[PDB]
Design an enzyme around this catalytic site. Structure first.
Site, PDB file in Angstrom:
ATOM      1  N   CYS A 253      12.079  23.589   8.711  1.00  0.00           N
ATOM      2  CA  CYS A 253      11.234  22.419   8.512  1.00  0.00           C
ATOM      3  C   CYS A 253       9.760  22.812   8.516  1.00  0.00           C
ATOM      4  O   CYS A 253       9.301  23.499   9.443  1.00  0.00           O
ATOM      5  CB  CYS A 253      11.486  21.380   9.609  1.00  0.00           C
ATOM      6  SG  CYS A 253      10.852  19.726   9.247  1.00  0.00           S
TER       7      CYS A 253
ATOM      8  N   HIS B 274       7.573  14.439  11.384  1.00  0.00           N
ATOM      9  CA  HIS B 274       8.797  14.442  12.184  1.00  0.00           C
ATOM     10  C   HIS B 274       8.631  15.169  13.518  1.00  0.00           C
ATOM     11  O   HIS B 274       9.424  14.950  14.431  1.00  0.00           O
ATOM     12  CB  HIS B 274       9.979  15.052  11.407  1.00  0.00           C
ATOM     13  CG  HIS B 274      11.324  14.647  11.868  1.00  0.00           C
ATOM     14  ND1 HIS B 274      11.756  13.332  11.798  1.00  0.00           N
ATOM     15  CD2 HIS B 274      12.342  15.357  12.392  1.00  0.00           C
ATOM     16  CE1 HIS B 274      13.016  13.272  12.263  1.00  0.00           C
ATOM     17  NE2 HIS B 274      13.380  14.498  12.642  1.00  0.00           N
TER      18      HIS B 274
ATOM     19  N   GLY C 100      15.299  24.978  11.689  1.00  0.00           N
ATOM     20  CA  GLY C 100      14.019  25.538  12.106  1.00  0.00           C
ATOM     21  C   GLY C 100      13.101  25.875  10.931  1.00  0.00           C
ATOM     22  O   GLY C 100      11.954  26.285  11.135  1.00  0.00           O
TER      23      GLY C 100
HETATM   24  C1  LIG Z   1      14.740  24.965  18.582  1.00  0.00           C
HETATM   25  C2  LIG Z   1      14.798  23.757  19.497  1.00  0.00           C
HETATM   26  C3  LIG Z   1      14.914  24.209  20.949  1.00  0.00           C
HETATM   27  C4  LIG Z   1      13.594  22.850  19.318  1.00  0.00           C
HETATM   28  C5  LIG Z   1      13.916  21.368  19.335  1.00  0.00           C
HETATM   29  N1  LIG Z   1      13.950  20.815  17.987  1.00  0.00           N
HETATM   30  C6  LIG Z   1      15.029  20.363  17.358  1.00  0.00           C
HETATM   31  C7  LIG Z   1      14.621  19.980  16.088  1.00  0.00           C
HETATM   32  C8  LIG Z   1      15.252  19.448  14.969  1.00  0.00           C
HETATM   33  C9  LIG Z   1      14.502  19.199  13.843  1.00  0.00           C
HETATM   34  N2  LIG Z   1      15.186  18.713  12.712  1.00  0.00           N
HETATM   35  C10 LIG Z   1      15.336  19.497  11.569  1.00  0.00           C
HETATM   36  C11 LIG Z   1      14.930  20.834  11.529  1.00  0.00           C
HETATM   37  C12 LIG Z   1      15.082  21.617  10.363  1.00  0.00           C
HETATM   38  O1  LIG Z   1      14.729  22.789  10.258  1.00  0.00           O
HETATM   39  N3  LIG Z   1      15.680  20.988   9.256  1.00  0.00           N
HETATM   40  C13 LIG Z   1      15.724  21.741   7.976  1.00  0.00           C
HETATM   41  C14 LIG Z   1      17.017  22.417   7.681  1.00  0.00           C
HETATM   42  N4  LIG Z   1      17.226  22.995   6.509  1.00  0.00           N
HETATM   43  C15 LIG Z   1      18.447  23.483   6.584  1.00  0.00           C
HETATM   44  N5  LIG Z   1      18.970  23.179   7.767  1.00  0.00           N
HETATM   45  C16 LIG Z   1      20.277  23.502   8.313  1.00  0.00           C
HETATM   46  N6  LIG Z   1      18.041  22.504   8.485  1.00  0.00           N
HETATM   47  C17 LIG Z   1      16.091  19.662   9.285  1.00  0.00           C
HETATM   48  O2  LIG Z   1      16.590  19.117   8.326  1.00  0.00           O
HETATM   49  N7  LIG Z   1      15.918  18.946  10.455  1.00  0.00           N
HETATM   50  C18 LIG Z   1      16.385  17.550  10.417  1.00  0.00           C
HETATM   51  C19 LIG Z   1      15.343  16.612   9.875  1.00  0.00           C
HETATM   52  C20 LIG Z   1      14.031  17.001   9.641  1.00  0.00           C
HETATM   53  C21 LIG Z   1      13.133  16.082   9.164  1.00  0.00           C
HETATM   54  F1  LIG Z   1      11.859  16.441   8.898  1.00  0.00           F
HETATM   55  C22 LIG Z   1      13.520  14.778   8.949  1.00  0.00           C
HETATM   56  F2  LIG Z   1      12.612  13.899   8.502  1.00  0.00           F
HETATM   57  C23 LIG Z   1      14.796  14.356   9.195  1.00  0.00           C
HETATM   58  C24 LIG Z   1      15.677  15.295   9.681  1.00  0.00           C
HETATM   59  F3  LIG Z   1      16.959  14.905   9.918  1.00  0.00           F
HETATM   60  C25 LIG Z   1      13.128  19.471  13.796  1.00  0.00           C
HETATM   61 CL1  LIG Z   1      12.214  19.115  12.350  1.00  0.00          CL
HETATM   62  C26 LIG Z   1      12.483  19.996  14.898  1.00  0.00           C
HETATM   63  C27 LIG Z   1      13.231  20.265  16.060  1.00  0.00           C
HETATM   64  N8  LIG Z   1      12.810  20.789  17.237  1.00  0.00           N
END
Ligand SMILES: CC(C)CCn1cc2cc(Nc3cc(=O)n(Cc4ncn(C)n4)c(=O)n3Cc3cc(F)c(F)cc3F)c(Cl)cc2n1
Ligand SMILES: CC(C)CCn1cc2cc(Nc3cc(=O)n(Cc4ncn(C)n4)c(=O)n3Cc3cc(F)c(F)cc3F)c(Cl)cc2n1
Lengths: 301, 301
Positions: free
Chosen positions: B145, B41, B143
């Protein structure tokens, strides 16, 4: 998102754990720079353990009576002293894995991570609170003596607990890293009861706020209460008093959820008077008191 | 009361956590020998995340597009490929902190330790179980992930989980370390619902054994059942059927207590059919399902 007891990563502490042996008596020690800290109980033979005179026992030891092992490496002891209930063994080599650290004494209600160890080898990590009666409800088996409790802030490990003994009720008792017991206990193999325990009010409130942040809200009501009236009820149910400082520390969770602190107090009051009537909060049938306001903010934000 | 969720010491895994960035998209990776494993991802821009063509996105990337960092130290990427939903980035440095390890794919009911990480920096450790619907009830913020789950058996780390996403209900979904999802989920940012969850029968049985070990055995009865008959009843109460493997991992608890597995099944069957009738087990009115038979022996013995 989700809510569980979360420990600090234990790696900074794992690199400090060693085994200390005196005769056949053996337990865990903490190796920081060129000193190993462990429970002074290690100087007792079997017969000594029931009723030790520790100043007497220690004067009858020299450096060569202590075997310190870091894995399979023996560390040569070049000095010994005792500070209250903690033995300090000076060794001839500095631990390169020593983190930045301090020794702190925590207050009842404060939480910490425990690294349970057996024969100097780390086995598990979990979160605990210092109970108002100065015990901890730990998970410790025979051989866990000298395991440590700690908090991590940035890169600094604050050691706050060294494990000594299990009481007959199955709760646990220990010291700070200056060798003073938490609570009215002594480092002797005799049956010791603790004082009657109370529930950590500010922590229950913090956990109710966690529940709301995670969408579990059934227990909220529209009553409110004064701080004094809430404290009268709390005291009646063997809950600790809630102070204005406590109200202040709950501020960020209050602001986040839009639920005034005294409104959440009114909610807790009704839970105490009416019970949970079969319902759960965050999957628990009991009111949880081993999350602090800080713990909740760090896990939720 | 008595049992708690205990994690493995996290040090062996902490030393493998890195940060992986592609443009501004950033998440956690796992550095073992000269390979960094992370969720594919990471190669999505915001506009890609809803419906990515991963083969297409990856063809447009070269080694130079990947920023891998251990703290603030960049690790130079010298190769890249994709295996199912995980990206494998070959780097020019073998991680000196690499433990003995293997990749395993776990079954529903099995527990593991999670090291939650943000920007390649470990923040906390906790235990959880894979639910029968292939989700986990984790604690994870944005974050997280690429955070991993693991068991440690004799200085070997068995990696079993890499975190990808939170589902609308607040539960969590991810892959093994070969990048195959647990459950019917895909790595794109669309609402995906978990199938209806069930109670983990083998773990409830383990918890009944735990209760017996600790002297709480009112619920043992004079009856037995076949495995098949039990399975048919269990499904009527939304309990998972038992497998032959499940019967086998209850073997040690059966032997320790002298209570045959099918006798314990008959005991649980009566609890399902008749309710708890006001009684508690290990202090609780709820039957716990996130402690495995292995968890019970670890904490009891
Ligand atoms: C800081 C920014 C400035 C930098 C930019 N950035 C924005 C981002 C957004 C991202 N998306 C996610 C991050 C994340 O931690 N979690 C986990 C999580 N657990 C509990 N919560 C509340 N979230 C997710 O679920 N997603 C969504 C997601 C992940 C996937 F791998 C998938 F296949 C589908 C999906 F929809 C990622 Cl991976 C990188 C990013 N980088
Ligand atoms: C050949 C060798 C393998 C064996 C020789 N040997 C036998 C030993 C016995 C020891 N005693 C204890 C060890 C231990 O891990 N825990 C912790 C615990 N937690 C949960 N449980 C169930 N037990 C204790 O409570 N005690 C008792 C105890 C400790 C004190 F420090 C104190 F001041 C008074 C006390 F009564 C020690 Cl310290 C060293 C020993 N060495």
């Amino acid at each position: 998102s989700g809510f569980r007891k979360m420990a600090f990563p234990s790696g900074k502490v794992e690199g400090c754990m060693v085994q200390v042996t005196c005769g056949t008596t053996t337990l865990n020690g903490l190796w920081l720079d060129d000193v190993v800290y462990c429970p002074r109980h290690v100087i007792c033979t079997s017969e000594d353990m029931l009723n030790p005179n520790y100043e007497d026992l220690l004067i009858r030891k020299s450096n060569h009576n202590f075997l310190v092992q870091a894995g399979n490496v023996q560390l040569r002891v070049i000095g010994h002293s005792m500070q209250n209930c903690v033995l300090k063994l000076k060794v001839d080599t500095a631990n390169p894995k020593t983190p930045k650290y301090k020794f702190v004494r925590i207050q009842p209600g404060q939480t910490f991570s425990v690294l349970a160890c057996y024969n100097g080898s780390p086995s598990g990590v979990y979160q605990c609170a210092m109970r108002p009666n100065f015990t901890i409800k730990g998970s410790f088996l025979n051989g866990s003596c000298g395991s440590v409790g700690f908090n991590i802030d940035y890169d600094c490990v604050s050691f706050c607990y060294m494990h000594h003994m299990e009481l007959p009720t199955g709760v646990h008792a220990g010291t700070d890293l200056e060798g003073n017991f938490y609570g009215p206990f002594v480092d002797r193999q005799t049956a010791q009861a603790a004082g009657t325990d109370t529930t950590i009010t500010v922590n229950v409130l913090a956990w109710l706020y966690a529940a709301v942040i995670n969408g579990d809200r059934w227990f909220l009501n529209r009553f409110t209460t004064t701080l004094n009236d809430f404290n009268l009820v709390a005291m009646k149910y063997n809950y600790e008093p809630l102070t204005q400082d406590h109200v202040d520390i709950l501020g960020p969770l209050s602001a986040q959820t839009g639920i005034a602190v005294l409104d959440m107090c009114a909610s807790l009051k009704e839970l105490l008077q009416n019970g949970m009537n079969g319902r759960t909060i965050l999957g628990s049938a009991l009111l949880e008191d081993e999350f602090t306001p800080f713990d909740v903010v760090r896990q939720c934000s």
